[PDB]
Ligand binder design. Structure first.
Ligand code: GTP
Ligand code: GTP
Ligand code: GDP
Ligand code: GDP
Ligand code: MG
Ligand code: MG
Lengths: 67, 420, 429, 429, 420
């Protein structure tokens, strides 16, 4: 369980203030975060496609062998 | 998707089918081995391509006629349904007794070829009309499969009796017997004569030794051009059924005419250019059709012009409008703009234009008229009737057949006179 | 927070939409493969680098959808938006609206639901189709019905390619075109009548080409629609939303059949030898010679005119030229609508598609007119219809598919009423 | 302090468990070698290096166990946790519940007792058995009774595969499934009904895999179960417990037959085109097509939906997306449950298996719904039973193993009781 | 585990058994010397694999004929227990006199083979219905062992009289005397007829010179494929008892037709593809089965299909659904999903796919009709009776036997029509 442990991604250090000035709203980097996340997912999909193409080509190779 | 099972019957059908598969193999860039270098062919182990054609007859000589010829090894021998007895040029033989107790195997193999498809569209048969095996087995197969698969459509590239000089002496009998089986169980029936083909090959291409191979080649080129707007891309693609709807106004006025263009000899090709007004000028000419019935003696209930290659559609539409408004007599009026057009995007192998003309005219009725004569002049004397009677044929059927034919021609006679 | 759904059905609709997406993906710097080296209306972000267009392509003949899947923009679309049937439409109605269209209507509605939830500030639809066809009318009618009974308030923008007077590419087109009016009135809000012969003549005279083709046709239609949606997509001194048309062009929701016009449609060399100011362009706009439909408004009146001037154009010149054009004698308005010219301005010029015959112009004006002359078109068409149905031509190909024949005259009744309604608003009171 | 036991009896559940342990070992870094180069919920420690998984693999037919007893993973399990017989049940009930079961179920009870006294905070059971085979039906019933009288208090969740609507791999399915319904109602507190044709269609349209196989279906089920036990295994910003599943989803002791769904089941290609947000994923998680039991949620009426998420998620996204969901009109709930959407979050994205058609993606949702449409499924199966019992078909094969004949009618009325309940609760006040 | 005893009998049984052990050897990779280069064979000290079998016949000539051919060294020299006098095709010879004096030692050695195993799942018999030796000693051994082992199952791969010609003119008498005792104490009566195998090896393989070796090889392939989904892994395994429940709905209607796929000649092998469609079409093909009764003229109470090869499963299920929803009339409807499938993970040596089809149909009732007809004819004239009463057997039995046969068919036809 270990509930309430990440706040993906959070848990800053000791530093803070008693009132209400900064809340890490928008993380001050939300836009770069979204951009890098999108790039990472595009890389993932490119790799998966690059693999599925070869896994398929194996089938045509087997077919030529059988013929 | 939207496949086609081609059938033959009789030596006419078999020869035309041989040349037709030759032309198709030429189009898709195949060699007689059957390897490339879904609508017609079927993929096969090792990249082969086998035609989807069932060949049938009771005279196993025509097999060795078609199989031995070039582009022959394609057809799979599991389809050559060849009864080892004979047909003998008689309808009742090939429809009731001899050529009928074999149809079960033909149905079984047609079913094997059909249930193996995804979305079958229509059947495409080629056969003669006086030929015993051809006409008989063709109409029996028609009855069976059309009572069996009504979802699909039917299309038959028939040949008619060469009107002036006959080729058999019992042609009227079997011709009208087949006619009485077509109007009841078909959906498209194009007609071709071996006479106008001669006038074409003699006055359009200046040939001197036209063998039946070249005439079959012309007919097969027309057949391919008919459905070329389906297996290929197109600015406005058509199919088998778009014709079957844009042409036949009523369930029986479904006997069309076929024309191919362009066709030119040595010098005539040296002189004339390739521009779609010229193709139109050659298309409508009465001496350019595969049906010995001068359309000038009638009108066109409708006519679909399927082009091929690449051309400005505005030129096509201007030519259609000009030929329709200028020959305002040779067209009927109660169906406005009775001419339909279509444009695929692939020229033939060795040109830059192409035109196939599929025209439901009301002028071919005259042809049937002459049959309505000959049969009638061969029935009051009961001539040659005992051969057909010798197979259980009840003459009563014969009678109604003629009566049916009557209505058919009568139908057309009611319409070329209709005014509005 | 702005977006439109662009449903393309039939055959002509899908090619027009192909050219339209060409123009759009071009003018927004988008590359045809989807990536990018002001677009939230049409294109949306796809969570991986590139962008995908808000569109769904229904069709039954797999040829055009296959050509799109193997053409240039194969990576642009989403491999689900391209819904391809299994057979053809055969140029009848019941085979796209009663028996077969029921196979694809539900899948289409699920896809449209997905597209709707993936959007926030919906503003309307854009359906493109012919009606002389088999599926462009039938499946289009079924889709209009399902949407009007499913979504409701969102207004639909039909772009129908009608049959022109003389040029004909089918013999049964009057039948199925009349079979679409029974549903064009009820479920559709705006219908921009587009013909072909008029645009062929337009390409002949202005663009100087003598071998025009359907591709140039679709290029011009795409240009008109882009100039229509520029106000949503871009800047402008006087913006005009897509909820402005309903308030500015629809007197009574039963007479909403508008017709288009565009300017300047000039070739390359015929702009060198000219001036092409705003005054001359707004004179040329009203000329029935270069109107985008077959009608001669000299034999009609004008209910309203929405003009959208894109490009560097100042408003005072528009106002003055509007005063002049309204003061002319041969262009007469109705009495019951004295202030008719609505005008909007956008500060972006046209963006010529590469390889086109048009010329780059600093200015452009797109007019959409709700007029009363278009009515005669309908009348003319009925003529054709009658001369067939007087002899029961081709009724068998429709009755064979469960279509109760008694609908036919009903349509030719209902559409007939339309004419009377126009004869109700041409009344100089 | 908490863990789960998972039993895989039969030949279906055992293949599902093969794929399931495959995925589990893959996600926790446990190499197939046991020795690795949050997991106490599944794997315990045999004092040295290799982590042994908690499970028993029962099957009378020793073929598949010999597939795993010498396959790629034989290093992992405990050679006593692989119990095999020397014959089959031949798809009939009594031979797996009266005669042959008598020997093996006692040994199973002893082994499960040992596994229980080994673990400390056991929280639930997970049996894995199709009802198609005589093993998964008879052995399933007998072991279920033995456990419900031995342990008792602990919950139970059977991922049981039923026979599909139309396709089947055995012709005597309606018999050896109805006899297990009596066991499934009383002793099996809940039941996560799974089918095949649903996952077949999912594979045929979503993942583009044209010729799917049992291994693909099993990989997908493994992903679903990992998503279910995510909150227990891994970290979580907002967790849920395997006891909390029950009271949030069991409104009455006799309506607890829950179906499931998972998203995004999308191949590599199509993932290149998707919004990927929480909105569209919890939107597609409600469409009927991707419901893992071939039923029609458009017809029934939901009662309670639990949603285990995973991957980075902002809870306000879940709240807004659920607002949009409850705003959708076509979906409707019963009166006695205005709050039916329970949520739960975890911070472990999906895991990829080499060869899995699932595209890697951060966000993922898995829904489990107690709804009243499922009744029709039962009714559907009832029909089959009718057209057999009239002719006493195959009955002697059952009476030849000590099973009284009247049991068939009794279990039939027992399931008619469910067909009464599940269409009695979904009624207005 | 789950072994199989190989009881033989009659010259046909012995030949088919020799060929069957040949096929199992060159599949399990056992060369005819008895090495490898438990389900069937038995380990033997020295590194040999002696096949668990037993061969019985009243002539010790079949001994030398079967030991002469290759793979004869496999059979141990001890199992060849053979009688001396010979039965000469007389049921009483092989069932009353010679039976009660050698079947003692037959049972002794059968028990010796039985207890030697750990789980003798089922039996396996190869014999005939015509010959006195085969039919008589086979039914007597079956009665004896089913009194011995009431828990195990039974199966007999029996050849029946061909309809056109007969091998031994007293075929009806021995046939009915074997079926009057087989129908009570046997679960899987796999019927075969020589004419069906003839037509298979000619029509579907173009082999012009068939020999009993090839026909026995075909029935060997069938018998092997029956159980091959047991001794091999598979995504869905079955056995010789899941069949029994998925096949027999009743204590009597348990007589199965057999079919194998794929089979094609030299010519048609280059063209045709090889996928679940084609395997299915050959599976349900009428002539492809090994029974002299076209199943299309009846229905199926049920049918199972054991595939082989690592292939998909959705194709399997959707094609079962298609072949059941299209050929629904020829199936019976008072049962749901009347077909059963099974899949293995190894095709036969030399291919990548295989199908073994088994059918509990109501189309063999016609075969039993013809057998009862022959019996009534040759019985009302007492033809060939003094052989069947000169050896301690009264006519009474004969009569009642036919009565039983009647009841058999009296059931089948019945369930063909009854609905609910
Ligand atoms: N403006 C324009 N019109 C087109 C285009 N392509 C086709 N059309 C029109 O489409 C009409 C023909 O009807 P179709 O739409 O092709 O018929 P359908 O409803 O799609 O049914 P099928 O084509 O048989 O599948 C003609 O009148 C054309 O004017 C195009 O690219 N641009
Ligand atoms: N979705 C899915 N279904 C499976 C899988 N393996 C088997 N099944 C199903 O299991 C059902 C048969 O029930 P089983 O219990 O496996 O049959 P059995 O084990 O041979 O039963 P007995 O031998 O008589 O004890 C079939 O419907 C299969 O579809 C799998 O891996 N995935
Ligand atoms: N153009 C052409 N016509 C043919 C050919 N073969 C036969 N015909 C026609 O076939 C007609 C005779 O009927 P037919 O079908 O050949 O008799 P059957 O085949 O023995 O039943 C004749 O009128 C011929 O014109 C051919 O190869 N080419
Ligand atoms: N398919 C096949 N049938 C056979 C073979 N040998 C014999 N038969 C049949 O065996 C039948 C005779 O039965 P059988 O008991 O072997 O004769 P018996 O030895 O004199 O008692 C005859 O109908 C033969 O046709 C064979 O090798 N292959
Ligand atoms: Mg269409
Ligand atoms: Mg089992």
């Amino acid at each position: 369980k270990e509930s309430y442990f990440r706040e993906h991604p959070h848990w800053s250090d000791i530093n803070g203030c008693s009132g209400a000035k900064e809340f890490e709203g928008e993380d001050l980097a939300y836009d770069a975060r979204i951009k890098y996340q999108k790039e990472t997912q595009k890389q993932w999909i490119e790799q998966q496609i690059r693999e599925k193409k070869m896994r398929e080509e194996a089938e045509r190779n087997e077919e030529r062998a059988y013929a | 998707m939207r496949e086609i099972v081609h059938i033959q019957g009789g030596q006419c059908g078999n020869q035309i089918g041989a040349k037709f598969w030759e032309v198709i193999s030429d189009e898709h860039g195949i060699d007689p081995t059957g390897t490339y270098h879904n609508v017609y062919y079927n993929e096969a182990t090792g990249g082969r391509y086998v035609p989807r054609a069932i060949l049938m007859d009771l005279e196993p000589g025509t097999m060795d006629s078609v199989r031995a010829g070039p582009f022959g090894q394609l057809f799979r021998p599991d389809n050559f349904v060849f009864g080892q007895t004979g047909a003998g040029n008689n309808w009742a033989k090939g429809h009731y007794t001899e050529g009928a107790e074999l149809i079960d195997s033909v149905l079984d193999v047609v079913r094997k070829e059909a249930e193996g498809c995804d979305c079958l569209q229509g059947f495409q048969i080629t056969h003669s009309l006086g030929g015993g095996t051809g006409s008989g087995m063709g109409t029996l197969l028609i009855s069976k499969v059309r009572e069996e698969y009504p979802d699909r459509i039917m299309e038959t590239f028939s040949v008619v009796p060469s009107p002036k000089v006959s080729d058999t002496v019992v042609e009227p009998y079997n011709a009208t017997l087949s006619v009485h089986q077509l109007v009841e169980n078909a959906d498209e029936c194009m007609v071709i004569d071996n006479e106008a083909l001669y006038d074409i090959c003699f006055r359009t291409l200046k040939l001197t030794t036209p063998t039946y191979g070249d005439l079959n080649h012309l007919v097969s080129a027309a057949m391919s051009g008919v459905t070329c707007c389906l297996r290929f891309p197109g600015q406005l693609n058509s199919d088998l059924r778009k014709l079957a709807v844009n042409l036949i106004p009523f369930p029986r006025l479904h006997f069309f005419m076929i024309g191919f263009a362009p066709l030119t000899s040595r010098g005539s090709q040296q002189y004339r250019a390739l521009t779609v007004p010229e193709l139109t000028q050659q298309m409508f000419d009465a001496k350019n059709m595969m049906c010995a019935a001068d359309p000038r003696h009638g009108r066109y209930l409708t006519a679909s012009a399927l082009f091929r290659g690449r051309m400005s559609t505005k030129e096509v539409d201007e030519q259609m409008l000009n030929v329709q408004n200028k020959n305002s007599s040779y067209f009927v009026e109660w169906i406005p703009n009775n001419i339909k057009s279509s444009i695929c995007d692939i020229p033939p192998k060795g040109l830059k234009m192409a035109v196939t003309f599929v025209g439901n005219s009301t002028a071919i009725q005259e042809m049937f008229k002459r049959v309505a004569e000959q049969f009638t002049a061969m029935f009051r004397r009961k001539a040659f009737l005992h051969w057909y009677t010798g197979e259980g044929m009840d003459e009563m059927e014969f009678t109604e057949a003629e009566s049916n034919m009557n209505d058919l021609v009568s139908e057309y006679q009611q319409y070329q006179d209709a005014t509005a | 927070m702005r977006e439109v759904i662009s449903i393309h059905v039939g055959q002509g609709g899908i090619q027009v939409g192909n050219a339209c997406w060409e123009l759009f993906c071009l003018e927004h710097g988008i590359q045809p493969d989807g990536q990018m080296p002001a677009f939230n209306t049409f294109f949306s972000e796809t969570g991986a680098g590139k962008h995908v267009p808000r569109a769904v392509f229904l069709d039954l003949e797999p040829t055009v959808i296959d050509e799109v899947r193997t053409g240039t923009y194969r990576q642009l679309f989403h491999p689900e938006q391209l819904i391809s049937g299994k057979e053809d439409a055969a140029n009848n109605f019941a085979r796209g609206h009663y028996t077969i269209g029921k196979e694809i209507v539900d899948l289409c509605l699920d896809r449209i639901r997905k597209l709707a939830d993936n959007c926030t500030g919906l503003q309307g639809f854009l359906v493109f189709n012919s009606v002389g066809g088999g599926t462009g009318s039938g499946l289009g009618s079924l889709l209009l019905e399902r949407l009007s009974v499913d979504y409701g308030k969102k207004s639909k923008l039909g772009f129908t390619i009608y049959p022109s007077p003389q040029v004909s590419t089918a013999v049964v087109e009057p039948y199925n075109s009349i079979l679409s009016t029974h549903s064009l009135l009820e479920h559709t809000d705006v219908a921009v009548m587009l013909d072909n012969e008029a645009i062929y003549d337009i390409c002949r005279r202005n663009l100087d080409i003598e071998r025009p083709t359907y591709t140039n046709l679709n290029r011009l239609i795409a240009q008109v629609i882009s100039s229509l949606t520029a106000s949503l997509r871009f800047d402008g001194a006087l913006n005009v939303d897509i909820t402005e048309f309903q308030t500015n062009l629809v007197p009574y929701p039963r007479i909403h059949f508008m017709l288009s016009s565009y300017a300047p449609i000039i070739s390359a060399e015929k702009a060198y030898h000219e001036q092409l100011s705003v005054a001359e362009i707004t004179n040329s706009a009203f000329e029935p010679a270069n109107m985008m439909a077959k009608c001669d408004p000299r034999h009609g009146k004008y209910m309203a005119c929405s003009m959208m001037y894109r490009g560097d154009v100042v408003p005072k010149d528009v106002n003055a030229s509007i005063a002049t054009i309204k003061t002319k004698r041969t262009i007469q308005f109705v009495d019951w609508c004295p202030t008719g010219f609505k005008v909007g301005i956008n500060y972006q010029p046209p963006t010529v598609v590469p390889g086109g015959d048009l010329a780059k112009v600093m200015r452009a004006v797109c007019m959409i007119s709700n007029s009363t002359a278009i009515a005669e078109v309908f009348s003319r068409l009925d003529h054709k219809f009658d001369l067939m149905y007087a002899k029961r031509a081709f009724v068998h190909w429709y009755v064979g598919e469960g279509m109760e024949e008694g609908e036919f005259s009903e349509a030719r009744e209902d559409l007939a009423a339309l004419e009377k309604d126009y004869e109700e608003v041409g009344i100089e009171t």
